[PDB]
Amino acid sequence: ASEGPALYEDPPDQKTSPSGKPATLKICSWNVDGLRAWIKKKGLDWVKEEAPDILCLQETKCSENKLPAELQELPGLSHQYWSAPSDKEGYSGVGLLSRQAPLKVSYGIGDEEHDQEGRVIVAEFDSFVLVTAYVPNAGRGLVRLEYRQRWDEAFRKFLKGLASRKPLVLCGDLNVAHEEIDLRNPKGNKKNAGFTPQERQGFGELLQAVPLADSFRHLYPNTPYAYTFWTYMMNARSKNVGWRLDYFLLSHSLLPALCDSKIRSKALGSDHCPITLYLAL
């Protein structure tokens, strides 16, 4: 490869808003790459250290009926909701674990075509709606890119609907590095899943249509080498050859409440690292 190590030190946790209000809500999002594999790699021990109010998980690869028992040993996240593929098999899948029960939990995006792979959970709270998503990969050889574009449109229109009623927080694996700054090797990936012009545009359209703001990039518009994903292959993580695929996207009305948007680079357990959002609601 042409890449060597590129340093990134995630700055300190800013736990107060620009107005001086302390953070009241702490959300953590993490593509676990297999719930049971993740647990075996002591992912839960890190959740305990982070002590989030809400935990959102993607790629659980686990049915709602076959959760591992250790999730019961998770103290302050007793309200747990799961969505998995309708075929009841072990792939994709998302989860949402919360300190308090949402006003309402929904699954999918109200479109039968896009709701069969357990990719979305909607949790409505008093002052905002939380959506966690595992966006369909464009696929090897981009064989699923045409569907991904259909997904992008439907998902975008769905979120616009939600945001019309309450402020929206979208988090999870959106499977795209928006800009060149969001991955280590933009040049060699323009025709690969996660950095096709199609996918990058879909992200821009998402920000515009709903509308939503990239919380991390809002606070750190010029910070390079901040990634949330590295291939297991090729010693990529140690060299920091990665992609920023995991986001917290906020309604514009929530920006005054934005305290910080973190990337927990050193937390192991998956090929993705956790991200954490501080909000002063």
Coordinates of C-alpha atoms in Angstrom, one line a residue:
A1 CA 0.0 0.0 0.0
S2 CA 1.0 3.7 -0.4
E3 CA -0.4 4.5 3.1
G4 CA 1.5 4.6 6.4
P5 CA 0.2 5.6 9.8
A6 CA -1.8 8.8 10.0
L7 CA -2.4 10.0 13.6
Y8 CA -5.7 10.9 15.0
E9 CA -6.4 11.8 18.6
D10 CA -10.1 12.4 19.2
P11 CA -10.3 15.6 21.2
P12 CA -11.6 15.7 24.8
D13 CA -15.3 15.3 25.7
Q14 CA -16.9 18.7 25.5
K15 CA -19.8 18.1 27.9
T16 CA -21.3 21.6 27.8
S17 CA -23.3 23.3 25.1
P18 CA -22.2 26.6 23.4
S19 CA -24.6 28.3 25.8
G20 CA -23.1 26.6 28.9
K21 CA -25.8 24.0 29.5
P22 CA -24.4 20.6 30.6
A23 CA -25.1 17.5 28.5
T24 CA -28.3 15.7 29.6
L25 CA -28.3 13.0 27.0
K26 CA -25.5 10.6 26.0
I27 CA -26.0 8.4 22.9
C28 CA -23.6 5.7 21.7
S29 CA -23.8 4.1 18.3
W30 CA -21.7 1.1 17.2
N31 CA -21.6 -1.4 14.3
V32 CA -20.8 -4.5 16.3
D33 CA -20.2 -6.8 13.4
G34 CA -21.9 -9.8 15.0
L35 CA -23.4 -9.3 18.5
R36 CA -22.0 -12.6 19.9
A37 CA -18.6 -12.0 18.3
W38 CA -18.6 -8.4 19.7
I39 CA -19.5 -9.7 23.2
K40 CA -16.7 -12.3 23.0
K41 CA -14.4 -9.4 22.2
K42 CA -15.5 -7.7 25.4
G43 CA -17.5 -5.0 23.7
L44 CA -19.9 -4.9 26.7
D45 CA -17.1 -3.9 29.1
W46 CA -16.6 -0.8 27.0
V47 CA -20.3 0.0 27.0
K48 CA -20.1 -0.1 30.8
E49 CA -17.2 2.4 30.8
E50 CA -19.0 4.7 28.4
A51 CA -22.2 4.5 30.4
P52 CA -24.5 5.9 27.7
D53 CA -28.1 6.8 28.2
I54 CA -28.9 5.2 24.9
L55 CA -27.0 2.5 23.0
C56 CA -27.7 1.9 19.3
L57 CA -26.2 -1.2 17.6
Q58 CA -25.9 -2.1 14.0
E59 CA -25.2 -5.4 12.2
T60 CA -26.3 -7.5 15.3
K61 CA -26.5 -10.5 13.0
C62 CA -28.9 -11.8 15.6
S63 CA -32.7 -12.5 15.6
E64 CA -34.9 -10.8 18.2
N65 CA -35.7 -14.3 19.5
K66 CA -32.1 -15.4 20.0
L67 CA -30.3 -12.6 21.9
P68 CA -27.3 -13.7 23.9
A69 CA -27.9 -13.8 27.7
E70 CA -25.2 -11.3 28.6
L71 CA -27.3 -8.3 27.5
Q72 CA -29.2 -8.8 30.7
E73 CA -26.0 -8.0 32.6
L74 CA -26.3 -4.5 31.2
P75 CA -27.3 -2.3 34.2
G76 CA -28.8 1.0 33.1
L77 CA -30.1 0.0 29.7
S78 CA -33.1 -2.1 30.6
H79 CA -35.3 -1.0 27.7
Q80 CA -34.1 -2.9 24.7
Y81 CA -35.6 -3.1 21.3
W82 CA -34.4 -5.2 18.3
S83 CA -35.1 -5.5 14.6
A84 CA -33.8 -8.4 12.4
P85 CA -34.5 -9.6 8.9
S86 CA -38.0 -10.9 8.2
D87 CA -36.6 -14.2 7.0
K88 CA -35.5 -14.8 10.6
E89 CA -31.9 -15.4 9.6
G90 CA -28.7 -14.1 11.1
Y91 CA -27.5 -11.1 9.2
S92 CA -27.9 -7.3 9.2
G93 CA -30.0 -6.4 12.2
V94 CA -30.1 -3.4 14.6
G95 CA -30.7 -2.7 18.2
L96 CA -31.6 0.1 20.5
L97 CA -31.1 0.0 24.3
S98 CA -32.3 2.9 26.4
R99 CA -32.2 4.0 30.1
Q100 CA -35.9 5.2 29.8
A101 CA -38.6 3.7 27.6
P102 CA -39.4 5.7 24.5
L103 CA -42.9 7.1 24.0
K104 CA -43.1 4.8 21.0
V105 CA -40.9 2.3 19.1
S106 CA -41.3 1.6 15.4
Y107 CA -39.4 -0.6 13.0
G108 CA -38.6 0.1 9.3
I109 CA -39.4 3.1 7.2
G110 CA -43.0 2.5 6.3
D111 CA -42.1 0.8 3.0
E112 CA -42.5 -2.9 2.5
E113 CA -39.7 -3.1 -0.1
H114 CA -37.1 -1.7 2.4
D115 CA -38.3 -3.1 5.7
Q116 CA -37.4 -6.8 5.3
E117 CA -33.8 -6.8 6.5
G118 CA -34.1 -5.3 10.0
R119 CA -32.2 -2.1 9.3
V120 CA -34.1 0.7 11.2
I121 CA -35.5 1.4 14.6
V122 CA -37.4 4.6 15.4
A123 CA -37.6 5.6 19.1
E124 CA -39.8 8.6 19.8
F125 CA -39.0 10.5 23.0
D126 CA -40.5 13.7 24.5
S127 CA -38.5 16.3 22.8
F128 CA -36.9 14.4 19.9
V129 CA -37.1 11.3 17.7
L130 CA -34.1 8.9 17.6
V131 CA -33.5 6.8 14.5
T132 CA -30.7 4.2 14.3
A133 CA -30.0 2.8 10.9
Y134 CA -27.9 0.2 9.1
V135 CA -27.9 1.4 5.5
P136 CA -27.6 -1.3 2.8
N137 CA -24.0 -1.7 1.4
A138 CA -23.6 -0.9 -2.3
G139 CA -22.1 -4.4 -2.5
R140 CA -19.0 -6.0 -4.1
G141 CA -18.8 -4.8 -7.7
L142 CA -21.6 -2.4 -6.8
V143 CA -24.1 -5.1 -7.6
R144 CA -26.5 -3.6 -5.0
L145 CA -25.9 0.1 -5.9
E146 CA -29.2 0.4 -7.9
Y147 CA -31.1 -0.8 -4.8
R148 CA -29.1 1.4 -2.5
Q149 CA -30.2 4.4 -4.6
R150 CA -33.8 3.3 -4.2
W151 CA -33.2 2.9 -0.5
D152 CA -31.6 6.3 -0.2
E153 CA -34.6 8.0 -1.7
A154 CA -37.2 6.2 0.4
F155 CA -35.2 6.6 3.6
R156 CA -34.7 10.3 2.9
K157 CA -38.4 10.9 2.3
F158 CA -39.3 8.9 5.5
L159 CA -37.0 11.0 7.7
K160 CA -38.3 14.2 6.2
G161 CA -41.7 13.1 7.4
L162 CA -40.5 12.4 11.0
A163 CA -38.6 15.7 11.2
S164 CA -41.8 17.6 10.2
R165 CA -43.2 16.7 13.6
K166 CA -40.3 16.5 16.0
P167 CA -36.5 17.2 16.0
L168 CA -34.6 14.2 14.7
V169 CA -31.4 12.4 15.6
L170 CA -30.2 9.9 13.0
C171 CA -27.3 7.6 14.0
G172 CA -25.7 4.4 12.8
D173 CA -23.8 2.9 9.8
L174 CA -24.9 5.0 6.8
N175 CA -22.3 3.2 4.6
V176 CA -20.8 6.2 2.9
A177 CA -17.9 8.5 3.4
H178 CA -19.5 11.8 2.4
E179 CA -16.4 13.7 1.4
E180 CA -12.7 13.0 0.6
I181 CA -11.8 14.0 4.1
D182 CA -14.0 11.2 5.4
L183 CA -11.6 8.4 4.2
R184 CA -7.9 7.8 3.9
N185 CA -7.9 6.8 0.2
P186 CA -10.5 8.7 -1.8
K187 CA -8.7 8.3 -5.2
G188 CA -8.7 4.5 -5.2
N189 CA -12.2 4.1 -3.9
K190 CA -14.3 6.2 -6.3
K191 CA -15.6 3.0 -7.9
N192 CA -16.0 1.0 -4.6
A193 CA -18.9 0.7 -2.3
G194 CA -19.0 3.6 0.2
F195 CA -17.5 6.2 -2.0
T196 CA -19.2 6.1 -5.3
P197 CA -20.5 9.5 -6.6
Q198 CA -24.0 8.0 -6.3
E199 CA -23.7 7.3 -2.6
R200 CA -21.9 10.6 -1.8
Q201 CA -24.7 12.5 -3.5
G202 CA -27.3 10.5 -1.6
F203 CA -25.7 11.7 1.6
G204 CA -25.7 15.3 0.5
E205 CA -29.4 14.9 -0.5
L206 CA -30.1 13.5 2.9
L207 CA -28.6 16.5 4.6
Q208 CA -30.5 18.9 2.3
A209 CA -33.9 17.3 2.1
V210 CA -34.8 16.6 5.7
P211 CA -32.7 18.7 6.6
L212 CA -29.9 17.3 8.7
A213 CA -26.4 18.4 9.9
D214 CA -23.3 16.2 10.2
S215 CA -22.7 16.8 14.0
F216 CA -19.0 15.7 13.9
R217 CA -18.1 17.6 10.7
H218 CA -20.1 20.6 12.0
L219 CA -17.8 20.8 15.1
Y220 CA -14.7 19.7 13.2
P221 CA -15.0 20.9 9.6
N222 CA -11.3 20.6 8.8
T223 CA -10.1 17.6 10.9
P224 CA -8.7 14.8 8.8
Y225 CA -8.0 11.2 9.6
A226 CA -11.1 10.8 11.8
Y227 CA -12.5 7.4 10.8
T228 CA -15.0 4.9 12.3
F229 CA -14.2 1.9 10.1
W230 CA -11.2 -0.1 9.0
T231 CA -11.0 -3.3 7.1
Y232 CA -9.8 -6.3 9.1
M233 CA -7.4 -7.0 6.2
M234 CA -4.1 -5.4 5.5
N235 CA -3.2 -4.1 8.9
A236 CA -5.5 -1.2 8.1
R237 CA -6.6 -0.1 11.6
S238 CA -3.0 0.2 12.8
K239 CA -2.1 2.4 9.8
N240 CA -5.4 4.2 10.2
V241 CA -6.5 3.5 6.7
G242 CA -10.2 3.9 7.3
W243 CA -13.6 5.4 6.4
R244 CA -16.0 7.5 8.4
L245 CA -19.2 5.5 7.8
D246 CA -20.8 6.1 11.2
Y247 CA -22.6 9.4 11.9
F248 CA -24.8 11.4 14.2
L249 CA -27.0 13.6 11.9
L250 CA -29.1 16.3 13.7
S251 CA -32.0 18.5 12.9
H252 CA -30.8 22.1 12.5
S253 CA -32.9 23.0 15.6
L254 CA -30.8 20.7 17.8
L255 CA -27.4 22.3 17.0
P256 CA -27.7 24.7 19.9
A257 CA -28.0 21.6 22.1
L258 CA -25.0 19.9 20.5
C259 CA -22.2 19.6 23.1
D260 CA -19.9 17.1 21.3
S261 CA -19.7 14.3 18.7
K262 CA -17.1 11.7 19.6
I263 CA -15.1 9.0 17.8
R264 CA -13.9 6.3 20.2
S265 CA -11.0 5.3 18.0
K266 CA -9.3 2.9 20.5
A267 CA -12.4 0.9 21.5
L268 CA -12.0 -2.6 20.1
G269 CA -14.5 -5.4 19.4
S270 CA -15.4 -4.8 15.7
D271 CA -14.1 -3.4 12.4
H272 CA -16.1 -0.3 13.4
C273 CA -15.4 1.8 16.5
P274 CA -18.1 3.4 18.6
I275 CA -19.3 7.0 18.2
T276 CA -20.9 9.1 21.0
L277 CA -23.1 12.1 21.0
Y278 CA -23.5 14.6 23.8
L279 CA -26.7 16.6 23.8
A280 CA -28.0 19.3 26.2
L281 CA -31.7 18.6 26.0

